[PDB]
Design a protein around this ligand. Structure first.
Ligand SMILES: [Ca+2]
Length: 123
């Protein structure tokens, strides 16, 4: 889920509005994504995109049929750390981990403004 991904990123980077700051960055952060990641933050998004793609192939996800986009989940944020809930079923848990991994990834890499709003055709 997106709206949950948004909260997860804010947990690690509280000075940020994720849907504004990490959208449309490089070749992978945002809609679609193809080509070579332009920097480490773009690589975080590529990994994320790959993780959701993988989620769709998961039987536990198919056998409920709702998507990486619809499969909700629960997580908690305690002084800048995210915990995916043990109550999450296998599908919700996979998606929560994809999101958690990307949030941690975003907080550990440089943000290069020259890559914001890249012409995705040089991707
Ligand atoms: Ca993407």
């Amino acid at each position: 889920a997106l709206w949950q991904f948004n909260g997860m990123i804010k947990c690690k980077i509280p000075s940020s509005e994720p849907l504004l700051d990490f959208n449309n960055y490089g070749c992978y952060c945002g809609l679609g994504g193809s080509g070579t990641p332009v920097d480490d933050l773009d690589r975080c998004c590529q990994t994320h995109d790959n993780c959701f793609k993988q989620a769709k192939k998961l039987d536990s996800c198919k056998v409920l049929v709702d998507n990486p986009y619809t499969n909700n989940f629960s997580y908690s944020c305690s002084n800048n750390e995210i915990t995916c809930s043990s109550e999450n079923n296998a599908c919700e848990a996979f998606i929560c981990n994809c999101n958690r991994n990307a949030a941690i990834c975003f907080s550990k890499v440089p943000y290069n403004k020259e890559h914001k709003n890249l012409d995705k055709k040089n991707c």
